[PDB]
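Supplementary material to the annual report.
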Amino acid sequence: PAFVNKLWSMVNDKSNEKFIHWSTSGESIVVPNRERFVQEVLAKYFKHSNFASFVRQLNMYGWHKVQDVKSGSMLSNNDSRWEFENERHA
Amino acid sequence: PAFVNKLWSMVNDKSNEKFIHWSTSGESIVVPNRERFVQEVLAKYFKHSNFASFVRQLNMYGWHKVQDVKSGSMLSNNDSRWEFENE
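Predicted assembly:
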């Protein structure tokens, strides 16, 4: 499961904090901005790969996008912000 | 315009994983088996259509088949395996 080793080598390396990190609250991995993450981190740990390909791998290992939160009167959601939770830790 | 929504509504729906998905490899859409794809997925998202029609649509939107790779002493290629990459 090489993916796993790469995932953690990426998430648990503080140098990638601004682009991907464990959430302050709850038990989840947060990607503040999909585009910047793809540009600065994904390209480094997962050569010639894209977001959908990455997320597909995460799913394979139990991680799934968290239910979206509709904010304010606009029922808005930052489509670029992604939060992932593992099925084994709800 | 409508083909696009259909394509992604199909590719990015995890329920279609076994028939069509993003390559674990590098930036491409993979159709493990053409025949199974046609009868189990295409038949649902693109009623009254066929593989050639679908691929033609893909081509028009920038996606094309990746160069074949001949494997082993037989220089073989699984004609049913289709992988597409964007322009």
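The CA atoms of residues 30 and 83 of chain B lie 4 Å apart.
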